[PDB]
Write a protein that binds this ligand. Structure first.
Ligand SMILES: OC[C@H]1O[C@H](O[C@H]2[C@@H](O)[C@H](O)[C@@H](CO)O[C@@H]2O)[C@@H](O)[C@@H](O)[C@@H]1O
Ligand code: CA
Length: 135
């Protein structure tokens, strides 16, 4: 069962929470990771299409589309490439077309574009974004 406002009460329920913020309250990737971890969770990992649908439905309910959200995607060592901050393997992927492209060699964190495609993009970790936590 999820905490109230994070999901449903069944044993199979996945718990995610959107943090959509105005520009003065958006956070860098590291700030967002630390925020979710302080609650006992982490930035959201998306391990399968079911979790993707769960998050998309939260976005539809929020009424705001096209927003960019930090996910738990962070580059590891050169041999690893992208990892999830929660330690789970990056197996399921939904990178946008041509991504990750490490544009200008400075893109080491992953964001979700909150439109129906639910696609991922690598971007500069110091950008200020909305974020999604999991617990
Ligand atoms: O800004 C770097 C970014 O540029 C291009 O992505 C565009 C768009 O698809 C992104 O959603 C937004 C927000 O991140 O930025 C651009 O408008 C692509 O070259 C992309 O790989 C790159 O990260
Ligand atoms: Ca990119």
């Amino acid at each position: 069962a999820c905490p109230e406002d994070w999901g449903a009460s069944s044993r199979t329920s996945l718990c995610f929470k959107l943090y959509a913020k105005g520009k003065h309250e958006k956070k860098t990737w590291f700030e967002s990771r630390d925020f979710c971890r302080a609650l006992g969770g982490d930035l959201a990992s998306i391990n399968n299409k079911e979790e993707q649908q769960t998050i998309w439905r939260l976005i539809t309910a929020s009424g705001s589309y096209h927003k960019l959200f930090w996910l738990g995607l962070t580059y590891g060592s050169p041999s690893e490439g992208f990892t999830w901050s929660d330690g789970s393997p990056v197996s399921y992927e939904n990178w946008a077309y041509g991504e990750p492209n490490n544009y200008q060699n400075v893109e080491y964190c992953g964001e979700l574009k909150g439109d129906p495609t639910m696609s991922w993009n690598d971007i500069n970790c110091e950008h200020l974004n909305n974020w999604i936590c999991q617990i």
